[PDB]
Paper text:
The human CDK-activating kinase (CAK) is a heterotrimeric protein complex formed by CDK7, cyclin H, and MAT1 and acts as a master regulator of cell growth and division. It regulates transcription initiation and the cell cycle by phosphorylating RNA polymerase II and cyclin-dependent kinases, respectively. Here, we use high-resolution cryo-EM to determine structures of the CDK-activating kinase, a master regulator of cell growth and division, in its free and nucleotide-bound states and in complex with 15 inhibitors at up to 1.8 Å resolution. Our structures provide detailed insight into inhibitor interactions and networks of water molecules in the active site of cyclin-dependent kinase 7 and provide insights into the mechanisms contributing to inhibitor selectivity, thereby providing the basis for rational design of next-generation therapeutics.
The bound ICEC-series compounds exploit hydrogen bonding interactions with the backbone amide and carbonyl of CDK7 residue M94 in the hinge region that are shared between all compounds, leading to a relatively well-preserved positioning of the pyrazolopyrimidine core within the CDK7 active site. Further interactions shared among the analyzed pyrazolopyrimidines are formed by the aliphatic substituent (ethyl for R3 = H in dinaciclib and isopropyl for R3 = CH3 in all other inhibitors) that protrudes into a hydrophobic cavity within the CDK7 active site formed by A39, I75, L144, A154, and the gatekeeper residue F91. The R1 substituent is the structurally most diverse among the inhibitors tested and engages in a variety of interactions that are specific to each inhibitor. For example, the protonated primary amine in BS-181 forms a salt bridge with CDK7 residue D97, while the trihydroxybutyl substituent in BS-194 engages in a hydrogen bonding network that involves bound water molecules in the CDK7 active site cavity as well as CDK7 residues E62 and D155. Interestingly, BS-194 is strongly selective for CDK2 over CDK7, while the related derivative BS-181, which is selective for CDK7 over CDK2, exhibits a ring-up conformation bound to CDK7. These observations support our hypothesis that this conformational change is due to properties of the respective CDK active sites, and that the ability of an inhibitor to accommodate this change may be connected to target preference, providing a possible secondary mechanism of the CDK7 selectivity of ICEC0942, in addition to the interactions formed by the hydroxypiperidine group (see above).
Numbering used by the authors:
A (entry chain J): 10 to 30, 37 to 42, 52 to 310
B (entry chain I): 1 to 38, 44 to 284
C (entry chain H): 244 to 308
Write the structure that this text describes.
């Protein structure tokens, strides 16, 4: 082909990834539906904070996708103890994530797999949403989705309660979890099961009531829990300023409709207050 | 969205003459390939067009009785795949019978209409050996179809724009009391528009609006004010003129469309079968 | 070095679509099906479907190849 392998990068359930000349190649059913999903969605999206699909090719039913080559991801930076995540760095990461997400939501697509390893950084410090193998368009009334989407640690309570129809709240809740992981340097809600995930959610954030989630009980896999008081957000995030706590609260609102959208998050005072986001070129490099 | 889509960028063409140019290049290129490999057996471009119309109709018939029911978006996507494929390919190199099924297969995957291969080929009216052979052929041609579509898989159809226009008419254009009365006839026109090259020549919104306005005109209703007032086209008269011309051109394409004739289809099918048996 | 929000600037080549939160006040939502309590609990509102349909109706209506 027109690409030559340089080094091996990683291996997944759906594919293997290798560096090439510089790009990253992700090498009776026919062509794999996850690869086709990535192709069909990324061909229609062009934004600085969304992974760029440059080429696709293969033979028979085996297909390879070509992407821009990224250096790291948010999981690596979070897990790196030799990197201090200053408030400016956190704001910059959140800003790029939210700008890519605002673009994606405007084109009626949900990522549905948001987590630190799916937020890739290039050498210039540009964050890009990646791994669109679970992404799906939203807004149609007659389409039904599955509630198993998103990694469990970053799954929204509406998903954990069995919501088939949902909106941008799934991505925004995952964004709140990513923000909390950035602040604490550990997964915010590390559940071992769906039941344990919901238990950790309600133990940390308080058990939601019918007032803060009016149709909570109508979700399929809804079950009554103990009425946990939760922990004050300033107790969880002792170094969070009031604006950042407001952003976190908006992202962690139980009601998905009331949960802030990407545009509303971008308009919040947290992003306009001092300090400004770190320029991508100065973001930490592990 | 359509306004920044690959359909608008790469698959909406400026004229029927450009489409004829592409198809003629395809036919001539196949003729040159065959001559280099080894003559009345060849098909003329208008005969290729007749066969492509016939097999697009066959693709519609396949999708209509497909179980589980295909969403209209999937059918429109598959038909658009078929049209795009035979813009740059000859029916004597890739048989339209297999290409149309591969179009349906890829469309079902792309539009998230999750079906297993066994039920897909079980929709085919064939023996189990014939169904397995067809599955083998479809899997052989899936990557080819994707390559020829240049990996542009999302197809913006006129149906959702049609819905949005109906919502807008119900909300903002009370001079039309019940816009739903326009649906069925407009639906018919949409189908009739789909058989032409309009899906390669105009935007889905223009096609949807043309269908609605043709339905209104056949109903005895002129919604000139919907364009001028509600669409706010009274600010720039040029835009109103261009939209009116686009709709007129679409109506012209529909009136000038001719379905394939039975005898011509029989003769051309015999020629196509000769083309694929020989060489 | 302070961030400031500006709306995404993407030309639609068609008529202006009313803002999502305006739809209910403008009477559009009377013509789309109401979201069920299950849908609302999941965060799906009929405003989403209506807004998408209007956006698709207006996208590229004025555009010419
Ligand atoms: C868009 C996609 C195909 C892409 C683009 N670049 N890229 C890289 N680049 C190198 C790298 C990135 C991020 C972290 C470390 C190394 C790796 C990869 N998969 C391997 C992940 C293993 C490491 C995970 C640790 N959390 N996929 C990609």
């Amino acid at each position: 082909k027109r690409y030559e392998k340089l080094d091996f990068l990683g291996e997944g359930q759906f594919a293997t990834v290798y560096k090439a000349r510089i790009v990253a190649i992700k090498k009776k059913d026919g062509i794999n539906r996850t690869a086709l999903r990535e192709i069909k969605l990324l061909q229609e999206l062009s934004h600085p904070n969304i992974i760029g699909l440059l080429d696709a090719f293969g033979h028979k039913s085996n297909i390879s996708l070509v992407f821009d080559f990224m250096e790291t991801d948010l999981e690596v930076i979070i897990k790196d103890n030799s990197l201090v995540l200053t408030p400016s760095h956190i704001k910059a990461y959140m800003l790029m994530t939210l700008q890519g997400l605002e673009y994606l939501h405007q084109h009626w697509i949900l990522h549905r797999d948001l987590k630190p390893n799916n937020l890739l950084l290039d050498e210039n410090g540009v964050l890009k949403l990646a791994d669109f193998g679970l992404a799906k368009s939203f807004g149609s009334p007659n389409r039904a989705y599955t509630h198993q989407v998103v990694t469990r640690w970053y799954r929204a309570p509406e998903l954990l309660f069995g919501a088939r129809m949902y909106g941008v709240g799934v991505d925004m809740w995952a964004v709140g979890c990513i923000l909390a992981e950035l602040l604490l340097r550990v997964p915010f809600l590390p559940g071992d099961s769906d039941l344990d995930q919901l238990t950790r959610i309600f133990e940390t954030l308080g058990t939601p009531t019918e007032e803060q989630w009016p149709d909570m009980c109508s979700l399929p896999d809804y079950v009554t829990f103990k009425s946990f008081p939760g922990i004050p957000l300033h107790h969880i995030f002792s170094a969070a300023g009031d604006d950042l706590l407001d952003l976190i609260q908006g992202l962690f609102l139980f009601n998905p409709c009331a949960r802030i959208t990407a545009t509303q998050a971008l308009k919040m005072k947290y992003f306009s207050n001092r300090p400004g986001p770190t320029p991508g070129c100065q973001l930490p490099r592990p | 969205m359509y306004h920044n889509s690959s359909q608008k960028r790469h698959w909406t063409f400026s004229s029927e003459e450009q489409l004829a140019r592409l198809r003629a290049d395809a036919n001539r290129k196949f003729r040159c390939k065959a001559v280099a490999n080894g003559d009345p057996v060849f098909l003329e471009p208008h005969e290729e067009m007749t066969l492509c119309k016939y097999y697009e109709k066959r693709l519609l018939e396949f999708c209509s009785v497909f179980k589980p029911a295909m969403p209209r978006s999937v059918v429109g996507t598959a038909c658009m795949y078929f049209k795009r494929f035979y813009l740059n390919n000859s029916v004597m190199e890739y048989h339209p019978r297999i290409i149309m099924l591969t179009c349906a297969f890829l469309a079902c995957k792309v539009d998230e209409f999750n079906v297993s291969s066994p039920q897909f080929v079980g929709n085919l009216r064939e023996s189990p050996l014939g169904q397995e052979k067809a599955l083998e052929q479809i899997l052989e041609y899936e990557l080819l179809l994707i390559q020829q579509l240049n990996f542009h898989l999302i197809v913006h159809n006129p149906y959702r724009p049609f819905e949005g226009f109906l919502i807008d008419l119900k909300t903002r254009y009370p001079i039309l009391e019940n816009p739903e009365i326009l649906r069925k006839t407009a639906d018919d026109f949409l189908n009739r528009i789909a058989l032409t090259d309009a899906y390669l020549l105009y935007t889905p919104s223009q096609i949807a609006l043309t269908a609605i306005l043709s339905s209104a005109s056949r109903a005895g209703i002129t919604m000139e004010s919907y364009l001028s007032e509600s669409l706010m086209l009274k600010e720039n008269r040029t835009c109103l003129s261009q939209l009116l011309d686009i709709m007129k051109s679409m109506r012209n394409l529909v009136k000038k469309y001719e379905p394939p004739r039975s005898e011509e289809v029989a003769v051309l099918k015999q020629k196509l079968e000769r083309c694929h048996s020989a060489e | 070095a302070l961030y400031e929000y500006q709306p995404l600037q993407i030309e639609t080549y068609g008529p202006h679509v009313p803002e999502l939160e305006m739809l209910g006040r403008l009477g559009y939502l009377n013509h789309v099906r109401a979201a069920s309590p299950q849908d609302l609990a999941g965060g799906y509102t009929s405003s989403l479907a209506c807004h998408r349909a209007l956006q698709d109706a207006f996208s590229g209506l004025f555009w010419q190849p």
